[PDB]
Amino acid sequence: DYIHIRIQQRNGRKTLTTVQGIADDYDKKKLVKAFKKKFACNGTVIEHPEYGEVIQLQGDQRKNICQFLVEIGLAKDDQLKVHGF
RNA sequence: GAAGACGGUCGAACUUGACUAUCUAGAGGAAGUAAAAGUCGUAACAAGGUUUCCGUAGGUGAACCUGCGGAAGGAUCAUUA
């Protein structure tokens, strides 16, 4: 159950980095209000349906996630699966 | 009538703290600046599609949003009952 991401870029620039694999019993207020106030990018929480509750931060956390995922203590340093859109 | 010498005064200098002024090293940290052809959003000159802005308080990725009292430098110098 690797927390899939996917990115999805509209315009030459109109991107949305999803988060697939994140439980719902986690802090849907602290998850993201810890994100936005961090690398400084518009997070939020939708019920995307090909995935099932994903967190839209507004940005390209493609290089940062690699990292906010060699740290922490929840995910894994191997379950890394980036398909930026 | 010399060296010396009693005690004093001036007091250089030296030793230790305090005081004041001026200058100057510094791991790192956080601003602002340049600036600028980068990344993510669209915050606010045409009513900029939420009129704008002031004082002030709280809050937000970020422009910013919002209440309360102002102003028009506004989009009304008029309202004809």
Reduced to 3 states, what is the DSSP secondary structure of residue A35? coil
- Cβ atoms of A19 and A7 closer than 8 Å: no
Give the resolution in Å: 7.8
Q: How far is CA A66 from CA A29, A35, A48, A63, A71, in A?
A: 23, 15, 23, 5, 9
Residue A72 CA distance to nucleotide B12 C1' (Å): 73
Q: Which nucleotides of B are covered by protein (CB under 7 A)?
A: 39-42, 60-62
Q: How far is the CA of A66 from the C1' of B78 (A)?
A: 67
Residue A49: Cβ within 10 Å count: 8
Method: X-ray
How many other CB atoms sit within 10 Å of the CB of residue A70?
Answer: 10
